[PDB]
Structure formats: C-alpha cells, structure tokens
Design a protein around this ligand. Structure first.
Ligand SMILES: Nc1nc2c(ncn2[C@@H]2O[C@H](COP(=O)(O)OP(=O)(O)NP(=O)(O)O)[C@@H](O)[C@H]2O)c(=O)[nH]1
Ligand SMILES: [Mg+2]
Lengths: 218, 167
C-alpha cells in the first residue's frame, strides 16, 4: 500500500493507493470526492499539479509512477495554487509521513545478530505490526540458526545502543519471554538501524500491556 | 480573525469523516472510506465572533496511530466521537482522552464528547452512561447524527466555546 498527499486550497488530503500503476485521474477522482464529500463534478473542474511544478496540469491518463512525486496540488482549472490558503511549509515532509503510515507494513532487513557480545550471524529481520521474525540467510560445517518469531504484543523496547559510523550501528530489542525479559542485539549500517529502530518504535506507541510492566520495573 | 484548530478523534467507523463533511459541505457521505488524515478550513460566526476553523479529520484505525503524536500537540480542542450503536467506540474514549492529556501534558484540554448516529434504532450506549462519563471528565456531551445533521453545528461550536473559555 502506498500514500500520496493531495494539497487543496482549504486543506490537505492523504490518499491511499494500491500501487504506482494507478492513474492520476483516479487519484484526482478520490481527492475531489473527499474534499467535497460528493463525486459530483460540479461547475468548476479540477486539475492536479506536481508540488514541484506549479501552474502545470498533470496528464490525468498518466500513471502515478510517471510523476516522480508523492505530493500533488488539487486546484480548480479556473484558479491558481496561489489563490488557496494551504500548501504550507509547517507540514511534515511527505517521506516522513509515508514512513509513519507504513509502520505496520511488513519489511525485511538484512542485519547481523550479535551473540554473547563476541560473535555475529547474518540474519534477515522481518518486521511488521504483527510480529518480528529473525531468520538466517544462505551443513556438516554450518548449523543454521533457530527461526525466532516474536509477537508484537511481547515487544517492550527497541533502542539504538551505539552509533560509531554510517556503516556501523547497534540496536537492542527487548521483549517478554515467559515472565522474563530477553534482549537481542543487532548490527548494521547507521541508516538501516535508524530505520529499524524508528519502525518498531512507531509500532510500540500503538500497543501496550507489557511495555508498561517493563517500564514500571525500570 | 481568530483561528481555532479542531481535531476529530475516535474509533473507526463512528462517523468522524461524515460529521466533518456535514459541517463543511452540508451533505451526508454514505460511503465508508477510511480516513488517513484530512484538514479543512471553514469560516463561521460563533457567538458574534467570526472564526477560522482548522478542522483535522484523523484516522480511527490503529495502523496510522503514529500520526497521533503530531496532531495532538498542535490541536487546541478535540472532538471525541463514539457511535451510540458501538459500545466499544464508547469504551475507546478512555484511550483517546488519556493519550491527549499525555501528549499535551495537561489536565485540562478543550474537549467535547460526541455520540454520533443518534438516528439509528440500535442504541447500545446509555445516554445516562455517556452523560456520566462527560461529567466525570468535565466536558460537554452532545448527541449528533451526520445523516440528519442533528447537532452537527452545535458539536463543533461547543468545542470552539470550550477552547475560548480555556484562554
Ligand atoms: N446512520 C448513520 N450512519 C452514519 C452516521 N455517521 C456516519 N455514518 C456512516 O458510518 C460509516 C462510517 O462513517 P465515517 O465518517 O467514514 O467514519 P469514520 O469515523 O470517519 N471512519 P474512519 O476512522 O475509518 O475514518 C459510513 O457508511 C457513514 O455513512 C450517522 O450519523 N448515521
Ligand atoms: Mg474517516
């Protein structure tokens, strides 16, 4: 699932789209019905403009991929973007907004899991609003790692333990394991770790009932 | 020109988007298109003062709960909406006020309790119970119907008044 922001003269509308194959005309149609309540075309027709290119009408038959953008201006054909009140600079940038809206979305990361503070194993870390899965990636000279699934309701904390350089960072994942709290350490580049830590923290501020007991103990 | 920033919160499907559009476009949206986030400006005269209403229509779905921390700091008043036919949407009001008073770090935040869908004959939430909740939290309680437009204007205007008393 993908998200675009539609800026109008009287506010913004966040629109969910299936994929980038969706036509800009369909996106227009959804925005107008949301802004005005009804799908009624009405006396004024409306146009979509890329946020980066003012006063220019988007090809409505073009795909959303054709536009290399996720923010668009909804403007009546008779008027201009400058006649409205919105299209503001206090609003959060679109990439951060899409990141917040996609927290529960499943995403996998290739990171290294640290064991006994002296060893590493390459794991691919699948995270979603449902669960966090830790799986190996590609036998007489190798035992694979036991696959581990942690239900999201068992998660207590996911913090950045250390950041040394853009290629090295460590984060700690705490969770409830049979009335006891286990801690998992992972290592990757700073950008990857920052995304993981932020993604889980979005999920944690969505659920409860075990983190609070952990924080009470702290 | 005083600007009041209003935020409509509540569980999914209770009619947050329908009430907001009823205020803005003055018609009833029968479709249930789940909200991510939407903002609307309306100019209105309340108690002799012309006011610019900045209305924020938020998501009832928990997948988009990460947006709640941003819109709860900036908002001045909050329209806490439940549906009279959805008992838990009433029970979920406790979570929404607690988060609002937590993010705002205050005990006295302009708020109005709204029981929507009062046109339906399938009421499951007591008006005594809902009135008792609002009294316990010290906020006005309004019943509304986005279908019949009952008390739609009163619900939003009362919140503006609650914001105005606060200052
Ligand atoms: N009978 C009746 N139906 C209503 C009323 N208000 C809303 N509805 C209906 O309830 C459904 C949900 O309304 P909607 O405004 O989308 O709810 P929401 O709280 O904004 N949902 P979400 O949080 O996902 O955005 C729609 O089908 C709408 O027509 C009302 O007062 N009466
Ligand atoms: Mg809605």
């Amino acid at each position: 699932s993908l998200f675009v922001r539609i800026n109008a003269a009287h506010g913004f509308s966040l629109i969910q789209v299936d994929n980038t194959k969706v036509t800009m005309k369909e996106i227009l149609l959804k925005a107008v019905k949301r802004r005005k309540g009804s799908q009624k075309v009405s006396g004024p027709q409306y146009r979509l403009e890329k946020q980066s290119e003012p006063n220019v009408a988007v090809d409505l038959d073009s795909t959303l991929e054709s536009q290399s953008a996720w923010e668009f201006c909804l403007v009546r054909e008779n008027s201009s973007r400058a006649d409205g009140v919105f299209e503001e600079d206090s609003q959060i940038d679109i990439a951060t907004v899409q990141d917040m809206l996609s927290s529960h979305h499943y995403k996998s990361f290739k990171v290294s899991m640290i064991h006994r503070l002296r060893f590493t194993t390459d794991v691919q870390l699948g995270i979603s609003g449902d669960k966090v899965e830790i799986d190996p990636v590609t036998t007489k000279f190798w035992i694979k790692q036991k696959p581990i699934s942690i239900d999201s309701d068992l998660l207590c904390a996911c913090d950045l333990a250390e950041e040394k350089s853009p290629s090295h960072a460590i984060f700690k994942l705490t969770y409830l394991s049979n009335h006891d709290y286990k801690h998992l350490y992972f290592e990757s580049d700073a950008a990857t770790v920052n995304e993981i830590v932020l993604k889980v923290n979005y999920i944690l501020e969505s659920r409860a009932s075990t983190a609070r007991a952990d924080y009470f103990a702290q | 020109m005083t600007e009041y920033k209003l935020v409509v919160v509540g569980a999914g499907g209770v009619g947050k988007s329908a009430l907001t559009i009823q205020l803005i476009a003055n018609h009833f949206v029968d479709e249930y298109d789940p909200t991510i986030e939407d903002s609307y400006r309306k100019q209105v005269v309340i108690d002799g003062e012309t006011c610019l209403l900045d209305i924020l229509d938020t998501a009832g779905q928990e997948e988009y709960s990460a947006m709640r921390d941003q819109y709860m700091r900036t908002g001045e008043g909050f329209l806490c909406v439940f549906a009279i036919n959805n008992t838990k949407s009433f029970e979920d009001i406790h979570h929404y006020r607690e988060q609002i008073k937590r993010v705002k770090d205050s005990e006295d935040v302009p708020m109005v309790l709204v029981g929507n869908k009062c046109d339906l004959p399938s009421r499951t939430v007591d008006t005594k119970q809902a009135q008792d909740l609002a009294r316990s939290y010290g906020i006005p309680f309004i019943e509304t119907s986005a279908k019949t437009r009952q008390g739609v204007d009163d619900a939003f205007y009362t919140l503006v008044r609650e914001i105005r008393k606060h200052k």
